[PDB]
Design a protein around this ligand. Structure first.
Ligand SMILES: [K+]
Ligand SMILES: [K+]
Ligand SMILES: [Mg+2]
Ligand SMILES: [Mg+2]
Ligand SMILES: [Mg+2]
Ligand SMILES: [Mg+2]
Ligand SMILES: [Mg+2]
Ligand SMILES: [Mg+2]
Ligand SMILES: [Mg+2]
Ligand SMILES: [Mg+2]
Ligand SMILES: [Mg+2]
Ligand SMILES: [Mg+2]
Ligand SMILES: [Mg+2]
Ligand SMILES: [Mg+2]
Ligand SMILES: [Mg+2]
Ligand SMILES: [Mg+2]
Ligand SMILES: [Mg+2]
Ligand SMILES: [Mg+2]
Ligand SMILES: [Mg+2]
Ligand SMILES: [Mg+2]
Ligand SMILES: [Mg+2]
Ligand SMILES: [Mg+2]
Ligand SMILES: [Mg+2]
Ligand SMILES: [Mg+2]
Ligand SMILES: [Mg+2]
Ligand SMILES: [Mg+2]
Ligand SMILES: [Mg+2]
Ligand SMILES: [Mg+2]
Ligand SMILES: [Mg+2]
Ligand SMILES: [Mg+2]
Ligand SMILES: [Mg+2]
Ligand SMILES: [Mg+2]
Ligand SMILES: [Mg+2]
Ligand SMILES: [Mg+2]
Ligand SMILES: [Mg+2]
Ligand SMILES: [Mg+2]
Ligand SMILES: [Mg+2]
Ligand SMILES: [Mg+2]
Ligand SMILES: [Mg+2]
Ligand SMILES: [Mg+2]
Ligand SMILES: [Mg+2]
Ligand SMILES: [Mg+2]
Ligand SMILES: [Mg+2]
Ligand SMILES: [Mg+2]
Ligand SMILES: [Mg+2]
Ligand SMILES: [Mg+2]
Ligand SMILES: [Mg+2]
Ligand SMILES: [Mg+2]
Ligand SMILES: [Mg+2]
Ligand SMILES: [Mg+2]
Ligand SMILES: [Mg+2]
Ligand SMILES: [Mg+2]
Ligand SMILES: [Mg+2]
Ligand SMILES: [Mg+2]
Ligand SMILES: [Mg+2]
Ligand SMILES: [Mg+2]
Lengths: 200, 115, 64, 142
RNA sequence: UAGCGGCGAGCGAACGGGGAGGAGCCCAGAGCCUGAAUCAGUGUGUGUGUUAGUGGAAGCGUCUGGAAAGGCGCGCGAUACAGGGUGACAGCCCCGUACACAAAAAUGCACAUGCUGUGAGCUCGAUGAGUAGGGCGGGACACGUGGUAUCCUGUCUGAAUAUGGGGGGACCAUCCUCCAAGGCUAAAUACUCCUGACUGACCGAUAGUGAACCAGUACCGUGAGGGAAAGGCGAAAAGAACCCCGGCGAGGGGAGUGAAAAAGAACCUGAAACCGUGUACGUACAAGCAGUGGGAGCAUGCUUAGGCGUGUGACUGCGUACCUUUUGUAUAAUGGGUCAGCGACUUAUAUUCUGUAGCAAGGUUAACCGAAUAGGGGAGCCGAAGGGAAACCGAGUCUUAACU
């Protein structure tokens, strides 16, 4: 169970999803994979093929005392080369469904022991204004947060773009690195119901 | 990502040239030449940690052999005389007592005379 | 791309349950009247490839 | 806490990087000897080349022929028998449960392990050891 | 994989299944009846968007410094802390940014839409000849003439024409299938010379385009063509008034600007090789990879009233460079004048093996749809049973007439 901060109602939350042991390797793998998937990998040099130069042997093989060459595009010359020029490549990697789910379960289970996870009832701002949202965190006594809601109110989102230490999401769009990065986490009783039912 | 390797080279060259600091000609100044000199210096430094122990041991024996023949005995008999009376004093010290306390060195030659 | 099989090897070998490859013996196509029967009988049944020359077979036909 | 996460012991293995000094162990010839075809870039030899000797896969004679009928027949394992519809498992209903491939007209039930419910098989080949089991469970074939 | 193949090297399908995507019709013509579906243009409507745009929130008192955004204390806006500037790091000084509104004309469009112009429903009847096929020679199909189907043909030929003809991988006979020798046709797909945004575990002047600089320039070549090098003063030119030496010079020295002129146009920093000037010691009877171990002297600093450190190194034991290649190198075998910079086991996809994590008689998805690094999508793959050339049998089976 998890008692609320303005009700004291017995929320029968599942034990198999939230009462778990931490698995650092899996979490690390998923959090690395998520970062590696964020790469766009747009980059290119040009090998001796793609360099703009003549084929011509600059000087003949023998006769001259100089060191045998056959290109002004060869990597050992100033201008033109880069032996192993990288191409634009897809750095993202496969993560197994159950690995990913298991990692989210494992990190979401740890927040109950850390007490970073704050479960709440009907959480919604009155109007799209940061002045209200900024002030209402002082009463609740928080600061660096990840607000997660099932019923995604536009009022709450609109007035939390420019606020940086706050990040609003939908319960559908929870992430591995997102849950780990932010100090506190805020979840609505509907949102935890949706996440519980989603992860299972 | 590209790595310029200008900071690190001079770091590892300056380490070596600072060891060669003192050597004649290019061996001090020039890296290519210094590097060899620094290594050969190491080889010799290792090689002569062993020879240091030999040279001094010759040098002592010489002093003792000289100091004994003043009192009228050859080293070979002097050592055998000391060893036969179960005397445990090494060369290093005998060479010191040879130079310094000759009244004490005299008594060792008598101590050895018995055997 | 995918590894291509050395097809000539695929026809001359066959993968077994343990992992080895059965093959047909040589010296039994022609010039048989001079060969004794006792040879011709022993060159008939299929034979397992020796462990010495297995690494060649594993490489040239990897897919089964 | 993001920076606190570390992998399992023996998970990451560093990897060999060649040609990087003496202390590296490998370095000057990246673990590939002195000279010869194997040391050269793009070196080595094609698969199954014993140096001009007629390779094992040519000195041995080819045999047999690949049957077309063998590709369109399946070996149904008795453990995956009662996973369809009560006890009716002809062919198309067995195919619907993704136990055997699509283009497979003929199929055969062999012995493997465990029957509980009675299963009536029909329009399908069955093995004598299986037929003893399927009848011992209860279900009658055809 | 099946096949093809000096059956070598290699090449390598289709059926069938997931998706993306969807769409169908005219001519080889006659009746009643005809502008009604259909498009192809003209004017014409709003939903509108494109080439000028405009507005566009909120900061100060102190300390340090040449200069404040900095440290320091209370603030204050945020549907705007994307980003860029300003005399050091700016949410609030300025440009902007979201965000809300823009067009006289040129328009890119999609629906009403009058309309030179175009033809519906429905009868009866037709359904593409030097063609299909064949002989010869080539080619295309994964298929190299092979037992070789099928399409295209250069050459030589030649049908039947819906009580009819093609295909089903030599070929033949019943069944299934379609209708060649006449035509059109959007979308999914490829591509970026090009005009805008926006992002980079992309580069930062030997890199990145050959080209950050008036570069495809100089220069080279008869020509095709080849083809360089060359970035940064400062916050701001405030780019040094005037004296001095000097050839009414070059260059310098004072004065003066500036925070700083060993920031003065060669102008941030300013390494190394290289060449210098002083200071200390050594060096003109001494042989050689020039060091190393010992080592007096001499020159010098500290605390103590005696010990330590740095520099030099007389004399003396040992001591024939480094790399490569080699049975073996001081070799008189190779390579290097030196310094600084760049310069060599990479990437993608398959595959096996080891580790490691997940889950386990199960494991896993590809493309793709997707408020999208979630979740759907198990098409498929791999495994859970093999044996046999194969039919086939299967905890066995193959061999064999049959196996102790
Ligand atoms: K403004
Ligand atoms: K005609
Ligand atoms: Mg020369
Ligand atoms: Mg030269
Ligand atoms: Mg380049
Ligand atoms: Mg490179
Ligand atoms: Mg160092
Ligand atoms: Mg076999
Ligand atoms: Mg055998
Ligand atoms: Mg190693
Ligand atoms: Mg090693
Ligand atoms: Mg080694
Ligand atoms: Mg070599
Ligand atoms: Mg050799
Ligand atoms: Mg070799
Ligand atoms: Mg031969
Ligand atoms: Mg299936
Ligand atoms: Mg080809
Ligand atoms: Mg404006
Ligand atoms: Mg201030
Ligand atoms: Mg401030
Ligand atoms: Mg500054
Ligand atoms: Mg307008
Ligand atoms: Mg207008
Ligand atoms: Mg026709
Ligand atoms: Mg024809
Ligand atoms: Mg024919
Ligand atoms: Mg061909
Ligand atoms: Mg036919
Ligand atoms: Mg035909
Ligand atoms: Mg047929
Ligand atoms: Mg047609
Ligand atoms: Mg088109
Ligand atoms: Mg298209
Ligand atoms: Mg980045
Ligand atoms: Mg960089
Ligand atoms: Mg350049
Ligand atoms: Mg430059
Ligand atoms: Mg520079
Ligand atoms: Mg400037
Ligand atoms: Mg004059
Ligand atoms: Mg200065
Ligand atoms: Mg200069
Ligand atoms: Mg500056
Ligand atoms: Mg300068
Ligand atoms: Mg000089
Ligand atoms: Mg002298
Ligand atoms: Mg000499
Ligand atoms: Mg001399
Ligand atoms: Mg000597
Ligand atoms: Mg020697
Ligand atoms: Mg030499
Ligand atoms: Mg010489
Ligand atoms: Mg060499
Ligand atoms: Mg030379
Ligand atoms: Mg089998």
């Amino acid at each position: 169970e998890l008692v609320l901060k303005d009700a004291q109602s017995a929320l029968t939350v599942s034990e198999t999803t939230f009462g778990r042991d931490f698995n650092e390797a899996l979490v690390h793998q998923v959090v690395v994979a998520y970062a590696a998937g964020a790469r766009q990998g747009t980059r290119a040099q040009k090998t001796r093929a793609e360099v703009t130069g003549s084929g011509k042997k600059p000087w003949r093989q023998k006769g001259t005392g100089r060191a045998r060459s056959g290109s002004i595009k060869s990597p050992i010359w100033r201008s033109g080369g880069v032996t192993f020029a990288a191409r634009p490549q897809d750095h993202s990697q496969k993560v197994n469904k159950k690995m990913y789910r298991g990692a989210l379960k494992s990190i979401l289970s740890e927040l109950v022991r850390q007490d970073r996870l704050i479960v709440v009832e009907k959480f919604s701002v009155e109007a799209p204004k940061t002045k209200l949202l900024a002030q209402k965190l002082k009463d609740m006594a928080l600061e660096d947060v990840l607000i997660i809601t099932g019923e995604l109110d536009e009022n709450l989102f609109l007035a939390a773009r420019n606020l940086h230490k706050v990040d609003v999401r939908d319960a559908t769009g929870i992430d591995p690195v997102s849950l780990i990065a932010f100090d506190k986490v805020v979840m609505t009783a509907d949102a935890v119901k949706q996440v519980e039912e989603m992860l299972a | 990502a590209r790595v310029k390797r200008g900071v690190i080279a001079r770091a590892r060259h300056k380490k070596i040239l600072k060891q060669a600091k003192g050597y004649y000609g290019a061996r001090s100044r020039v890296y290519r030449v210094a590097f060899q000199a620094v290594i050969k210096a190491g080889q010799y430094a290792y090689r002569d940690r062993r020879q240091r122990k030999r040279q001094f041991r010759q040098l002592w024996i010489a002093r003792i052999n000289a100091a004994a023949r003043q009192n009228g005995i050859s080293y070979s008999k002097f050592i055998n005389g000391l060893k036969k009376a179960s005397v445990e004093i090494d060369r290093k010290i005998l060479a010191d007592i040879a130079v310094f306390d000759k009244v004490a060195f005299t008594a060792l030659v008598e101590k050895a005379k018995a055997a | 791309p995918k590894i291509k099989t050395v097809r000539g090897a695929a026809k001359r070998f066959k993968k077994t349950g343990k992992g080895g490859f059965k093959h047909k013996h040589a010296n039994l196509r022609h010039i048989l009247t001079k060969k004794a029967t006792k040879r011709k009988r022993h060159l008939r049944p299929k034979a397992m490839v020796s462990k010495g020359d297995l690494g060649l077979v594993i490489a040239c036909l990897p897919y089964a | 806490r993001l920076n606190t996460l570390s992998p399992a012991e023996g998970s990451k293995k560093a990897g060999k990087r060649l040609g990087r000094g003496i202390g590296s162990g490998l370095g000057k010839t990246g673990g590939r000897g002195h000279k010869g075809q194997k040391s050269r870039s793009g070196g080595g030899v094609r698969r199954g080349f014993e140096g001009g000797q007629m390779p094992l896969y040519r000195r041995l004679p080819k045999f047999g022929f690949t049957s077309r009928k063998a590709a369109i027949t399946a070996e149904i394992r008795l453990s995956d028998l009662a996973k369809v519809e009560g006890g009716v498992v002809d062919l198309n209903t067995l195919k619907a449960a993704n136990i055997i491939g699509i283009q497979i007209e003929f199929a055969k039930v062999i012995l493997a392990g465990e029957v509980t419910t009675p299963v009536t098989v029909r329009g399908l080949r069955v093995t004598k050891g299986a037929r003893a089991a399927i009848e011992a469970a209860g279900g009658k074939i055809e």
